């Protein structure tokens, strides 16, 4: 991601529990680290956003990308499928 799309968390409505969950599981362990190692609680390695279509999963992903200094690396499922064997 080089354009850094802009989407403040205020633009996401109806998901306050889920936004906090994603920030604490994908962001808090990222920029703090040593704190988590202090309490010795293993942060989850990944977050799977599942729900009915249009619930706003991609919107929360965009919000995290916009309000996170981390280097977002987007990609799509179809993108990791290629004809040549082993290309994916």
């Amino acid at each position: 991601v080089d354009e850094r799309p802009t989407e403040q968390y205020s633009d996401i409505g109806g998901l306050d529990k889920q936004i906090q969950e994603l920030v604490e599981a994908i962001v808090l362990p990222m920029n703090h680290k040593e704190k988590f190692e202090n309490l010795g609680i293993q942060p989850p390695k990944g977050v799977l956003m599942y729900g009915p279509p249009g619930t706003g999963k991609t919107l929360l992903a965009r919000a995290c990308a916009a309000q996170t200094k981390a280097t977002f690396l987007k990609l799509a499922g179809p993108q990791l499928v290629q004809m040549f064997i082993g290309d994916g």
């Binding site: 604490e24 808090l28 704190k35 010795g40």
Partner: protein
């Protein structure tokens, strides 16, 4: 004049060390030149043994060649399936290589000869006892089993609440042996019809023998391929014919219960509150807590009845402490999560 002569020795000795290093550097330069003439050798498998001096090798990503061994090679090693490096021009088998990797084999071959004490899996002293009474006698004294005549003790079952520590039971009983301790949970053994067998039923017993004692651990049999006749044929095949290295299948999920189809069946009780304390203590050990922390009244208000319920309650308690610099959890903090998870689980 002595100092000057010693000074010359310093310059002279520096050159001697440098030339020695230069010779070492050059001797490497000669070595790489010799390796330059070296040519690659294709990699293939010895599919079959036509004769003493003739072999069938299928190149990794090419055609199959009939080739012959170099000469000073132990033809015993070149058995069907062995990897070999054919010469690029004569296509003659030159050397054998070990086989490794493979996508599917990550959990059906790995051995775990660790030592996890039964204290790690708390509140199941009675349940662990049956495992020893079921997996210890057959392993220790096959002679007494053969003396009586009844050879196969296989079967077993751990039906009960989901994921309350079922894997741990097969781990705590792994105190002695249980090295490989493979897991094939609902997958690769029947796959509805026969989908999985030999390469998904024998390859099991395979490492389950070419190694120390292991546990097949066909956990969660209630989700295999998602058929009953195939499963009945599945459990009555040559499986018990060999029973190599006292490997006992330990299926656990929820006239097939008779001997030869399913051995002792044990129902895992819902986590007892008095046992619930045991779980909170072991599970909550690692998290940095404070002295005032009490694992006493949590169970009274924490009857989630699931082992993982206690794990996240311990972990989710930390996330309560993630906000604020609290390096330790307080008794109220645990009660805060217990009133959350013990009520959240209802949704």
């Amino acid at each position: 004049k002595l100092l000057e002569h010693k000074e010359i020795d310093g310059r002279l000795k520096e050159l001697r060390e440098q030339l020695k290093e230069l010779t070492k550097q050059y001797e490497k330069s000669e070595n790489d030149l010799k390796a330059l003439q070296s040519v690659g050798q294709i990699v293939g498998e010895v599919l079959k043994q036509l004769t003493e001096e003739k072999f069938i090798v299928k190149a990794t990503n090419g055609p199959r060649y009939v080739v012959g061994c170099r000469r000073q090679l132990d033809k015993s090693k070149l058995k069907p399936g062995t990897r070999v490096a054919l010469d690029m021009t004569t296509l003659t088998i030159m050397r054998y290589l070990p086989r490794e990797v493979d996508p599917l084999v990550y959990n059906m071959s790995h051995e775990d000869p660790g030592n996890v004490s039964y204290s790690e899996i708390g509140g199941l002293s009675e349940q662990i006892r049956e495992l020893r009474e079921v997996i210890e006698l057959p392993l220790t004294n096959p002679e007494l089993f053969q003396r009586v005549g009844i050879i196969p003790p296989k079967g077993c079952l751990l039906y009960g609440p989901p994921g309350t520590g079922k894997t741990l039971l097969a781990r705590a009983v792994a105190s002695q042996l249980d090295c490989n301790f493979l897991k094939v949970v609902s997958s690769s053994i029947v796959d509805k019809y026969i989908g999985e067998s030999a390469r998904l039923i024998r390859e099991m017993f395979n490492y389950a023998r070419d190694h120390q004692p292991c546990i097949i651990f066909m956990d969660e049999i209630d989700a295999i391929g998602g058929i009953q006749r195939t499963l009945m044929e599945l459990l009555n095949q040559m499986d018990g014919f060999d029973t190599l290295h006292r490997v006992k299948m330990i299926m656990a999920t929820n006239a097939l219960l008779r001997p030869g189809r399913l051995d002792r069946k044990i129902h895992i009780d819902l986590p007892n509150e008095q046992a619930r304390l045991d779980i909170l203590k072991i599970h909550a050990g690692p998290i940095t807590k404070h002295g005032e922390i009490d694992y006493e009244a949590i169970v009274k208000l924490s009857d989630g009845f699931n082992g993982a319920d206690l794990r996240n309650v311990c972990t989710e308690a930390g996330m309560f402490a993630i906000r604020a610099d609290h390096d330790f959890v307080v008794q109220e903090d645990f009660m805060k999560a217990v009133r959350k998870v013990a009520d959240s689980k209802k949704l």
